[PDB]
C-alpha cells in the first residue's frame, strides 16, 4: 500500500500550491492596465520576401547582428540570408532531410540544426577552408530534436521529443546536464537574457523553469488545455509567454508563479505555432495555423494587428535584437520581413 | 563607396553560385518520390524493404522511403513532417490484445488528420499465410459483424485457398475501406494490397500506386477529376 498514499500526498501538495497561488492573486493584469493608452492598430508591410527553399520551412533564427538569419526547410537545406539585400550568404546541405529546428550562435560563428535524426549538428561558418562544414554531431537524445539554443560557442541546450531537455558541451560532445520531468514531448525552449534559466513547453500542457547550473526544475506553470507549441521570454526575464494547440496564448510570471493574461479570441480556433515579443515587450506576435500572424497588446490582450501574407501554415516567427524587423516563415517555403 | 562596390559585387556573385546549385538539386527533389513506411507494430514491416532511410529505383524513378526508428509511439507531432510525401505505406498484420483494431484506429487518425488530408495511403495487409492458418484451425469474436459478411462479387478467387480465407481477408480490407470512403474523397486515396512475406514484388505495386497518385493530382489540378 504505497501507490495509493503517494497520490494522496501529491494532491495535498498540489492544492497547497493552488491556495498559495490563489492567495497571491490580488488584481488581474487587466485591472492594472485598464486605464493605459491602447497601442492602436499596427500596420506592418512585407518589406522583403526571401525565396529559395524547396519545401516547407520549419524553423528560422536571427543573428545577434540583426542582419543575418538562418532558416531550416524540410527539403534538406539550411540557408543563411542577408535580410537587408535578400542575398543567400550560405546554403548548406544536411544529411537528414527532416530538420525541425535551427539555431544561430550569438557570436555568429556557428549554426545548429536538428530533427527526426535525434541529433544536433553544429556547423562552422568561419572555417579556414572557406566552406561551411559540420564540426560536431551531438547524440544521446532518444527522440526527435524540437529546439536548440546556443549559450556560447561551446554550450547548447536542446529540447527533444523524448520528454527530456539536455545541456551539451560542443568541444567534447558530451551531455553535461539532463533536464527531466516533462510528461510529453518538449516542443520549445527559450533562454533567459542572462542565460542562467530557461523555460520549456511540452505536450503535457505544462511549462517548466530550469536552472542551467544546478540542473533541476524550479517551477512548473500549468494553465493550458492542450499541447504547448511555442514559448518565449519577456525581455526583462521575469515573465514568459506560451502558445498552445487550444488556440490561446498565455503570459506567466515567475515571481507570482501564476498565469497573468490570456490572449484568445472567439474567431480563432487554430493552434499557435510561434510566439515572440517586441523590443520593449509591449507587442506579442503569434503565428497561427490559419496562415496569418497576430499582433497582441501584451498588457491589454487586445489584438492590435494582423500579418497576413503567407499561403500556408505559419511555422516560425522571430523578432530582431534591435526590434527593427519581424521575420515569418511558413509551409509555403517563403520568409517575409515586416516593418 | 569603393568598399561597398566590391562587397555588393562579391555578395551578388555568391548568391548567383548558390542559386545555380539550388536549381540543380530542385530537379532531383521534384523527380524523387518520398514515402513514409509506417506500421502499428511489428506487422512484418521490415519485409517490404527487404533504420531511417532506404533508397530504391523502379523504371528509372527514384523512391525515398523513410522508416521511423527511435521515435516514441506518440505520433501526433512528428507525423506532421510527412504531410508532403507522395504516399504513406501503412503495413498491417492481418493475422490479429486485438492489434487489428489498433491498426484501424491509427488509420482513422491519419486519414482524418488536418495536415494528412491530401496524403494518400498505400495499405499492405501482411500475414496472409498466417491468417489462412488461423481461420482453418478455428477474428470471429473480435468483430461480431464477421458472421454477416459475404465475399464481394468483384473479388479475386485466388486459386489455392478455400473461400473461408478469402471471406476473412476481404472483410479486413473492407474495414479500412469503410474508413477510407466514409471521409474525404478526391484529395487522397487508399490503395489496399494483399501482400505476403514470400515475394518482394511490392516494389512494383508502390511504383504503380505512386504513378496513379501523380496522375490523379495532375487531373485534379485541371479540374478533370
Amino acid at each position, epitope marked *: 500500500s504505497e501507490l495509493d498514499q503517494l497520490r494522496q500526498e501529491a494532491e495535498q501538495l498540489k492544492n497547497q500550491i493552488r491556495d498559495a497561488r490563489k492567495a497571491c492573486a490580488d488584481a488581474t493584469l487587466s485591472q492594472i492596465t485598464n486605464n493605459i493608452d491602447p497601442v492602436g492598430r499596427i500596420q506592418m508591410r512585407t518589406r522583403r520576401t526571401l525565396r529559395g527553399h524547396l519545401a516547407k520551412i520549419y524553423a528560422m533564427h536571427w543573428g545577434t547582428d540583426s542582419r543575418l538569419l538562418v532558416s531550416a526547410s524540410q527539403d534538406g537545406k539550411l540557408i543563411i540570408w542577408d535580410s537587408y539585400t535578400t542575398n543567400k550568404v550560405h546554403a548548406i546541405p544536411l544529411r537528414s532531410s527532416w530538420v525541425m529546428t535551427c539555431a544561430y550562435a550569438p557570436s555568429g560563428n556557428y549554426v545548429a540544426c536538428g530533427g527526426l535524426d535525434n541529433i544536433c549538428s553544429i556547423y562552422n561558418l568561419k572555417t579556414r577552408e572557406g566552406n561551411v562544414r559540420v564540426s560536431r554531431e551531438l547524440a544521446g537524445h532518444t527522440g526527435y530534436l524540437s529546439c536548440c539554443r546556443f549559450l556560447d560557442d561551446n554550450q547548447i541546450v536542446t529540447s527533444s521529443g523524448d520528454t527530456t531537455c539536455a545541456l551539451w558541451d560542443i568541444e567534447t560532445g558530451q551531455q553535461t546536464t539532463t533536464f527531466t520531468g516533462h510528461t510529453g514531448d518538449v516542443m520549445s525552449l527559450s533562454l533567459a537574457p542572462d542565460t542562467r534559466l530557461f523555460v520549456s513547453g511540452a505536450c503535457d500542457a505544462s511549462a517548466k523553469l530550469w536552472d542551467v547550473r544546478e540542473g533541476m526544475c524550479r517551477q512548473t506553470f500549468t494553465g493550458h488545455e*492542450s499541447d504547448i507549441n511555442a514559448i518565449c521570454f519577456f525581455p526583462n526575464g521575469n515573465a514568459f509567454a506560451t502558445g498552445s494547440d487550444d488556440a490561446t496564448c498565455r503570459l506567466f510570471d515567475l515571481r507570482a508563479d501564476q498565469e497573468l493574461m490570456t490572449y484568445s479570441h472567439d474567431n480563432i480556433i487554430c493552434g499557435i505555432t510561434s510566439v515572440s515579443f517586441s523590443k520593449s515587450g509591449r507587442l506579442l506576435l503569434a503565428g497561427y495555423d490559419d496562415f496569418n500572424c497576430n499582433v497582441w497588446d501584451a498588457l491589454k490582450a487586445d489584438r492590435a494587428g494582423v500579418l497576413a501574407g503567407h499561403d500556408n501554415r505559419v511555422s516560425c516567427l522571430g523578432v530582431t535584437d534591435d526590434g527593427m524587423a519581424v521575420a515569418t516563415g511558413s509551409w509555403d517555403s517563403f520568409l517575409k520581413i515586416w516593418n | 563607396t569603393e568598399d561597398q562596390r566590391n562587397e555588393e559585387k562579391a555578395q551578388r556573385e555568391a548568391n548567383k553560385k548558390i542559386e545555380k546549385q539550388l536549381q540543380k538539386d530542385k530537379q532531383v527533389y521534384r523527380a524523387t518520390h518520398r514515402l513514409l513506411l509506417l506500421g502499428a507494430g511489428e506487422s512484418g514491416k521490415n519485409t517490404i524493404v527487404k533504420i531511417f532511410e532506404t533508397k530504391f529505383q523502379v523504371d528509372k524513378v527514384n523512391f525515398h522511403m523513410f522508416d521511423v526508428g527511435a521515435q516514441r509511439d*506518440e505520433r*501526433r507531432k512528428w507525423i506532421q513532417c510527412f504531410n508532403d510525401v507522395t504516399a504513406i505505406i501503412f503495413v498491417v498484420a492481418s493475422s490479429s*490484445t*486485438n492489434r487489428l483494431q*489498433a491498426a484501424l484506429k491509427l488509420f*482513422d*487518425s491519419i486519414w*482524418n488528420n488536418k495536415w494528412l488530408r491530401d496524403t494518400s495511403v498505400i495499405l499492405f495487409l501482411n500475414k496472409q499465410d498466417l491468417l489462412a492458418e488461423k481461420v482453418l484451425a478455428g477474428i470471429e469474436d473480435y468483430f461480431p459483424e464477421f458472421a454477416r459478411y459475404t465475399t464481394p462479387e468483384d473479388a479475386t478467387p485466388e486459386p489455392g485457398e478455400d473461400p473461408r480465407v478469402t471471406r476473412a481477408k476481404y472483410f479486413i480490407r473492407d474495414e479500412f475501406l469503410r474508413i477510407s470512403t466514409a471521409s474525404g474523397d478526391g484529395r487522397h486515396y487508399c490503395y489496399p494490397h494483399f501482400t505476403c512475406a514470400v515475394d518482394t514484388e511490392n516494389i512494383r505495386r508502390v511504383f504503380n500506386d505512386c504513378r496513379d497518385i501523380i496522375q490523379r493530382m495532375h487531373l485534379r489540378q485541371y479540374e478533370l477529376l
Partner: nanobody
Amino acid sequence: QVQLQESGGGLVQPGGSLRLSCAASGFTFSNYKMNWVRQAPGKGLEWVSDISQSGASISYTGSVKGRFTISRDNAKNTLYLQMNSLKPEDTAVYYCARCPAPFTRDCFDVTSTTYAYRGQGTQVTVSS
C-alpha cells in the same frame, strides 16, 4: 491543470451491470472528443469506446459492441460508460482518455508512454 478522475468500478458477478463516471476539469469539455480505454492484466492499453463532442458519433470495439454504451453530459463535465453482461474477459483497469486537440476528428491517445490527458483509472474486476 487538465484533471480526469474516474469513479466507479469494483467486483461484480458475471452477467452483472456496472457504471463508470469520468469527472473532467481544467478544460472546456464540449470542445473535445472523449474516449474509453482499458488495460487487462498482462496486456497493453486497448481502446474500448469513444464519443464525439456533440454525442452524435459513437464507436465501440467489437468485443463490447452491443453491451457497453457511452454517454457524455456537457453540463457536469462528466463521461459515462454503462456496462452490461460483464463476462470475465472484461476484468481490466478502465481509463478515461481525452483527444489531444479541440475541434478535431483525429485522436492519438492509446499510448502507454505516459499519455498526458488520461485519467488515473478505476479497476473493474469480474470473477465468479
